[PDB]
């Protein structure tokens, strides 16, 4: 199944965004969601990074909060505040959705794991299509 062990983070939720890429887009989404929530409202959760999908699950009860195919993840970033992580999905052909997280001590290891999954997936796809 997974590539690494799940990440214990807070799921801040998801919001629609106008564009598939940009740190300005993800930081606008982060500011909006942080302004309309408090730390107690935050959903403790973990992110499972598998080869083809990212799955977000409720803290240790492990219900499914979201699932995302790497091929439809258009962009990811760490926010200006180093605890925040976001990725943008193409929910459909012209429809974008931004998923956001609070990470302790920071978002370094989640973002690395997600970036690595993207880079690995791209090579596996190029290689599949060249055979």
């Amino acid at each position: 199944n997974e590539l690494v062990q799940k990440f214990q983070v807070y799921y801040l939720g998801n919001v629609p965004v106008a564009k598939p890429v940009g740190v300005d887009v993800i930081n606008g989404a982060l500011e909006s969601v942080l302004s309309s929530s408090s730390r107690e409202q935050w959903t403790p959760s973990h992110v499972s990074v598998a080869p083809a999908t990212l799955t977000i699950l409720h803290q240790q009860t492990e219900a499914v909060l979201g699932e995302c195919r790497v091929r439809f993840l258009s962009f990811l970033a760490v926010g200006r505040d180093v605890h925040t992580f976001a990725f943008i999905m193409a929910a459909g052909p012209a429809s974008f959705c931004c998923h956001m997280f609070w990470c302790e001590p920071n978002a370094a290891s989640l973002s690395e794991a997600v970036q690595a999954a993207c880079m690995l997936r791209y090579q596996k796809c190029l290689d599949a299509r060249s055979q």
Binding site: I26, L76, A77, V82, A108, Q115
Partner: peptide, 27 residues
């Protein structure tokens, strides 16, 4: 400056555009 630290600043200033997305996008 550390490896985690340098990759973080890059993650913050530029983020990362998934090439897997663009691969299937240009098809």
């Amino acid at each position: 400056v550390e490896p985690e630290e340098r990759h973080l600043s890059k993650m913050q200033q530029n983020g990362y555009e998934n090439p897997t997305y663009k691969f299937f996008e240009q098809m």
